[PDB]
Amino acid sequence: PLYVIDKPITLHILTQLRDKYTDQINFRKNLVRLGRILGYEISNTLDYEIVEVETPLGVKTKGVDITDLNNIVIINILRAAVPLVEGLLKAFPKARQGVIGASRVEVDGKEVPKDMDVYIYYKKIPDIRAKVDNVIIADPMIATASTMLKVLEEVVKANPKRIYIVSIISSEYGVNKILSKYPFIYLFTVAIDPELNNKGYILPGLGDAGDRAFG
Amino acid sequence: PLYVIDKPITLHILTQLRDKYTDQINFRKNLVRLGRILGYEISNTLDYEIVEVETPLGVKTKGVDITDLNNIVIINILRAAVPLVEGLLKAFPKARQGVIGASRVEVDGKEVPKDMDVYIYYKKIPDIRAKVDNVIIADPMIATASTMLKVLEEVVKANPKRIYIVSIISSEYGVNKILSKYPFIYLFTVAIDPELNNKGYILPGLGDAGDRAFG
Amino acid sequence: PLYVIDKPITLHILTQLRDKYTDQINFRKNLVRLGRILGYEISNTLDYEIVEVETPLGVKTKGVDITDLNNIVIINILRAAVPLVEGLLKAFPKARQGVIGASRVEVDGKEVPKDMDVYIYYKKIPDIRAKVDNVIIADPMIATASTMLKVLEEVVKANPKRIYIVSIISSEYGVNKILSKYPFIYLFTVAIDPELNNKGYILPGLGDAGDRAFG
Amino acid sequence: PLYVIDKPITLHILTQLRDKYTDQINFRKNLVRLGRILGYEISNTLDYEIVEVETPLGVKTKGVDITDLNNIVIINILRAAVPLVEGLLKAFPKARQGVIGASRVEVDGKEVPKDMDVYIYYKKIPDIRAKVDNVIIADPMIATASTMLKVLEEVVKANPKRIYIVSIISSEYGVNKILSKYPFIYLFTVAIDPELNNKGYILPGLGDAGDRAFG
Ligand SMILES: Nc1ccn([C@@H]2O[C@H](COP(=O)(O)OP(=O)(O)OP(=O)(O)O)[C@@H](O)[C@H]2O)c(=O)n1
Numbered sequence A, B, C, D: 001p002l003y004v005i006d007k008p009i010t011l012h013i014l015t016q017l018r019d020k021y022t023d024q025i026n027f028r029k030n031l032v033r034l035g036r037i038l039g040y041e042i043s044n045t046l047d048y049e050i051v052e053v054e055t056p057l058g059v060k061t062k063g064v065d066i067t068d069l070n071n072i073v074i075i076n077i078l079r080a081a082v083p084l085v086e087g088l089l090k091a092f093p094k095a096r097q098g099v100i101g102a103s104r105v106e107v108d109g110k111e112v113p114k115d116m117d118v119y120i121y122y123k124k125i126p127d128i129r130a131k132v133d134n135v136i137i138a139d140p141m142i143a144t145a146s147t148m149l150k151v152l153e154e155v156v157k158a159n160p161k162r163i164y165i166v167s168i169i170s171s172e173y174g175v176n177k178i179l180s181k182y183p184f185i186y187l188f189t190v191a192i193d194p195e196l197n198n199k200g201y202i203l204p205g206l207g208d209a210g211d212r213a214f215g
């Protein structure tokens, strides 16, 4: 499943993120704000149950209960993902969090890269209950999808109920590379940009997330 | 314009609010959470302009800018509205806030009320720039719409660019009474309940907002 | 007990509040920020129990547990108090909240007022468990103390374990009027100003809280 | 300068952190809450200036202005530091943030370690304006101080106005190793534990921060 959340407000925020004239502080704040929104969006795709509920007026009426809100595990790739994850956590108060610090190797090639090398420097995750937990992996940018793939390479092992991916911008290349390998993934993104350059950056994109957030 | 935000997450929260077994603390927390969501929702209906922006990659791309995010005035009816307004404020960081403390007189009549008598005990509002400001009036419950009408009775005077009304539950009666008197209002609500009782309470509803929040 | 929290940060914020050139938005934001801080401050005066706990290293060590953090009731006077209460609530996550909407009558007299007439327009409070609950009443300004006294006039009825009063600025007159009538009250304030004018305003003070927040 | 913030509330939170029976969610939440508090505490040690301002009552009074609140750079060591940094950021709204991902090598030795080997896997920091910026480095635990030292090894290069270190628990050994090498550092901690074990863990301590937060 591919979800492109292009509502006014998310595009508005995305514009600010794209704007090279946005300082790191506001860059991060916007990233958190988006995380919260994308969380809301994911919420409505979550599996839920119909229930009945009684009101103070002594009458019963039917309602909804997204019990799955207790079966969420957010994976923090770290670095630029932090502010985004922060937003997601605010969205899912009862979510557990694990971290899989992965970093692709920045390299300048002759052609547009198809894959980068990614390494997991730190891993500490909660226990992902197979068939029960909804796992959400966040990463502001998905270029060659190499980073996401490395993380997924082992989130899938746990066989979660669902696996959501959340990013601000994903390249057409990355999106296809991921969904063709794991068609069951719910991929959420604010925008899908057309191309990558020789260094592996999304165009137009918004520059290097890490630098835009901490530089 | 009538907007009934019945997405899973808002219904989920509404269910918790309806549930007579929800303590005041969680009642309020849920009210704030909804406020933020409804804010997000309103955001996407806001008037916006298309712009262009240059990304760090030295390329220009078009984007959105909801400049109107600077022309928002939230009116706090006070009492139960507080938690809801709190949520709205978190949604509109740059919003100004005024307060019009209005309270209908709780009375027990023979038939289902069509109007209650509301009085403004405190009024202090910013400068509502005609044709420019988007005014948002919040009230968890709209039963006879008498309360909303009293407030509107003078928000309209300022002739804002737009006037949004936000509630958790509104009675079919209230919604009709408001939109037929001010067809231009953007009325947002999570649910529209069918009837009112002799005391003027929404059925099923969720009881007395004030009591559910501070009792 | 009188507590004047005059640490750099609280004075810094108080300065912003005093400055007449501070818009309502930042006025309110600062009020919330102070509420948090004052909450923290009150926390450390709270009654607590020494306990023992076992760390992951399989060793036991003594610790503290402010169980009273579950026995807090914050009373919202409404209007300008809202932002301050918001800050307090963020400080006491598990606090219940009641509201006693009281408003003194603004009048211009020949001399400096010694009392104003305050009326309770709305009252809805949780159950204040005598000898157990720590009640916190917030009001940004305490001039003739007439407002605080009216509220206390019945918070005392419930015979709480403790009663804390929180304000940004209190007049020397008010502070003495309160603590001499209820010596057991824990009165917290960022600053105590010297005099009141003929209309009953604190000098230097910071103007009318309501107007500075919603005007 | 050594600052041991042992007020009721910080000890209360520290107790929860120490308790091995605290799940990762509440572990993290407490870490953020402390970050805020410790931020508040640091705030009051900040350099400030005395100013004057005119209140709405047309009178001038002196006030404080901690201008340095604009000259703060928080360094995120990543991993367990994240929640702590999150708290600090909430305390310093205008703070810039850089990250120096450093990780000591966990090893089991015969005796109590005196140093571990730490490596910097990722570094991206803002402009640390010499003599002007107040740098705050956060790390929940300081055992052999090897991690802090590695980070400081190059924060010092920038010659900031001040350098604050923030941790929940620091070993007597670490505290001594740091302050004797950089006597000018403002070291803030909630508690100083007596010893380390053969693996380099603080006793009593609270276990492995990373595991307590993401395990
Ligand atoms: N120097 C700063 C200041 C803030 N932040 C991030 O921005 C968030 C909140 O910004 P603000 O708009 O002041 O808070 P609200 O969104 O209005 O409320 P909340 O923090 O609960 O979302 C912080 O939590 C943090 O994640 C940051 O990265 N760097």
Ligand SMILES: Nc1ccn([C@@H]2O[C@H](COP(=O)(O)OP(=O)(O)OP(=O)(O)O)[C@@H](O)[C@H]2O)c(=O)n1
Residues within 6 Å of the ligand: A086, A089, A090, A092, A093, A094, A095, A096, A097, C090, C093, D025, D028, D029, D032, D083, D086, D090
């Ligand atoms: N599953 C979760 C839920 C929350 N958090 C952390 O705990 C913080 C807030 O917890 P809550 O008490 O719900 O928010 P408040 O402290 O009351 O307000 P604020 O978030 O602005 O501090 C989040 O921002 C986040 O840093 C987390 O790590 N994991």
Ligand SMILES: Nc1ccn([C@@H]2O[C@H](COP(=O)(O)OP(=O)(O)OP(=O)(O)O)[C@@H](O)[C@H]2O)c(=O)n1
Residues within 6 Å of the ligand: A090, A093, B025, B028, B029, B032, B083, B086, B090, C086, C089, C090, C092, C093, C094, C095, C096, C097
């Ligand atoms: N006893 C309490 C505690 C909280 N609240 C309300 O609930 C809000 C936040 O609850 P929490 O989930 O701890 O904060 P987050 O939603 O996670 O982050 P934020 O406060 O910025 O929304 C408070 O701001 C306040 O409006 C309340 O009315 N009464």
Ligand SMILES: Nc1ccn([C@@H]2O[C@H](COP(=O)(O)OP(=O)(O)OP(=O)(O)O)[C@@H](O)[C@H]2O)c(=O)n1
Residues within 6 Å of the ligand: B086, B089, B090, B092, B093, B094, B095, B096, B097, C025, C028, C029, C032, C083, C086, C090, D090, D093
């Ligand atoms: N137009 C606005 C915007 C904000 N606020 C108040 O200021 C608070 C938060 O301001 P911000 O600094 O953006 O949030 P943080 O303090 O950083 O995090 P938190 O909201 O949980 O305290 C809101 O919750 C609200 O009480 C307000 O009264 N009017």
Ligand SMILES: O=c1ccn([C@@H]2O[C@H](COP(=O)(O)O)[C@@H](O)[C@H]2O)c(=O)[nH]1
Residues within 6 Å of the ligand: A080, A104, A116, A118, A139, A140, A141, A142, A143, A144, A145, A146, A147, A148, A174, A200, A201, A202, A203, A205, A206, A207, A208, A209, A210
């Ligand atoms: O334009 C880009 C492309 C990638 N990245 C970063 O590089 C990593 C590589 O993603 P990928 O190319 O492996 O998909 C991601 O963590 C992301 O933060 C950017 O900051 N900007």
Ligand SMILES: O=c1ccn([C@@H]2O[C@H](COP(=O)(O)O)[C@@H](O)[C@H]2O)c(=O)[nH]1
Residues within 6 Å of the ligand: B080, B104, B116, B118, B139, B140, B141, B142, B143, B144, B145, B146, B147, B148, B174, B200, B201, B202, B203, B205, B206, B207, B208, B209, B210
């Ligand atoms: O079922 C109801 C109906 C109304 N009200 C409260 O009574 C007021 C009256 O609204 P109205 O009947 O004038 O529309 C509103 O402020 C609202 O909070 C409730 O709490 N519950």
Ligand SMILES: O=c1ccn([C@@H]2O[C@H](COP(=O)(O)O)[C@@H](O)[C@H]2O)c(=O)[nH]1
Residues within 6 Å of the ligand: C080, C104, C116, C118, C139, C140, C141, C142, C143, C144, C145, C146, C147, C148, C174, C200, C201, C202, C203, C205, C206, C207, C208, C209, C210
């Ligand atoms: O300088 C002042 C004095 C009072 N008040 C407001 O007037 C009320 C009266 O307090 P008191 O004079 O009864 O103590 C309080 O709610 C307070 O908000 C102000 O806003 N500014």
Ligand SMILES: O=c1ccn([C@@H]2O[C@H](COP(=O)(O)O)[C@@H](O)[C@H]2O)c(=O)[nH]1
Residues within 6 Å of the ligand: D080, D104, D116, D118, D139, D140, D141, D142, D143, D144, D145, D146, D147, D148, D174, D200, D201, D202, D203, D205, D206, D207, D208, D209, D210
């Ligand atoms: O009891 C301990 C000791 C250390 N650490 C972690 O190990 C690192 C090493 O600190 P140090 O021993 O180099 O001072 C720190 O990042 C810290 O998070 C813990 O989690 N618990």
